[PDB]
Amino acid sequence: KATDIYAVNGTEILLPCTFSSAFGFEDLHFRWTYNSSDAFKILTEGTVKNEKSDPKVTLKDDDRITLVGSKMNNISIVLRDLEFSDTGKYTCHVKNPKENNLQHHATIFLQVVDR
């Protein structure tokens, strides 16, 4: 379900994205987006060759983003050095073209807090 997470300005936060497949996959694609009322950003995208391959990133548009590393079902991201402006809606999308399947994980609302 649409989930809220709170993080303090200047710290880092892990935004999770967990995918399992019943019988594996080939050529998975993923995308993380950010939404506010006045901006949309594609944060990072990449591919996963199969269920025992590591994700490969093909787009990163903020150097404060890293993919967590392993558990071969993980396209979670860590966003470091949080700013006021990072508050908003983060969504992980996973596409399985061979199965014409597209999974939108529940949007995460990140609230960056001072006090």
Curated annotation (Swiss-Prot):
Disulfide bond sites: 17-92
Involvement in disorder: Long QT syndrome 10: A heart disorder characterized by a prolonged QT interval on the ECG and polymorphic ventricular arrhythmias. They cause syncope and sudden death in response to exercise or emotional stress, and can present with a sentinel event of sudden cardiac death in infancy. Atrial fibrillation, familial, 17: A familial form of atrial fibrillation, a common sustained cardiac rhythm disturbance. Atrial fibrillation is characterized by disorganized atrial electrical activity and ineffective atrial contraction promoting blood stasis in the atria and reduces ventricular filling. It can result in palpitations, syncope, thromboembolic stroke, and congestive heart failure.
Organism: Homo sapiens
Native organism taxonomy: Eukaryota, Metazoa, Chordata, Craniata, Vertebrata
Function: Regulatory subunit of multiple voltage-gated sodium (Nav) channels directly mediating the depolarization of excitable membranes. Navs, also called VGSCs (voltage-gated sodium channels) or VDSCs (voltage-dependent sodium channels), operate by switching between closed and open conformations depending on the voltage difference across the membrane. In the open conformation they allow Na(+) ions to selectively pass through the pore, along their electrochemical gradient.
Domain Ig-like C2-type, chain residue ranges per copy: 1-109
Bilayer disposition of the protein: Single-pass type I membrane protein
Quaternary state and interactors: A voltage-gated sodium (Nav) channel consists of an ion-conducting pore-forming alpha subunit functional on its own that is regulated by one or more beta subunits. The beta subunit SCN4B is disulfide-linked to the pore-forming alpha subunit. Interacts with SCN1A; regulatory subunit of SCN1A/Nav1.1. Interacts with SCN2A; regulatory subunit of SCN2A/Nav1.2.
PTM note: Contains an interchain disulfide bond with SCN2A. N-glycosylated.
The family this protein is said to belong to: Belongs to the sodium channel auxiliary subunit SCN4B (TC 8.A.17) family.
Residues carrying sugar: 9, 35, 74
Annotated localization: Cell membrane
Cellular component aspect of the GO annotation: intercalated disc; plasma membrane; voltage-gated sodium channel complex
Keyword annotations: Atrial fibrillation, Cell membrane, Disease variant, Disulfide bond, Glycoprotein, Immunoglobulin domain, Ion transport, Long QT syndrome, Membrane, Signal, Sodium, Sodium transport, Transmembrane, Transmembrane helix, Transport
GO molecular function: sodium channel regulator activity; transmembrane transporter binding; voltage-gated sodium channel activity; voltage-gated sodium channel activity involved in cardiac muscle cell action potential
Protein name (database record): Sodium channel regulatory subunit beta-4
Topology Extracellular: residue spans: 1-115
BP-aspect Gene Ontology terms: AV node cell action potential; cardiac conduction; cardiac muscle cell action potential involved in contraction; cardiac muscle contraction; establishment of localization in cell; membrane depolarization during cardiac muscle cell action potential; neuronal action potential; positive regulation of sodium ion transport
Tissue expression as described in the entry: Expressed at a high level in dorsal root ganglia, at a lower level in brain, spinal cord, skeletal muscle and heart. Expressed in the atrium.
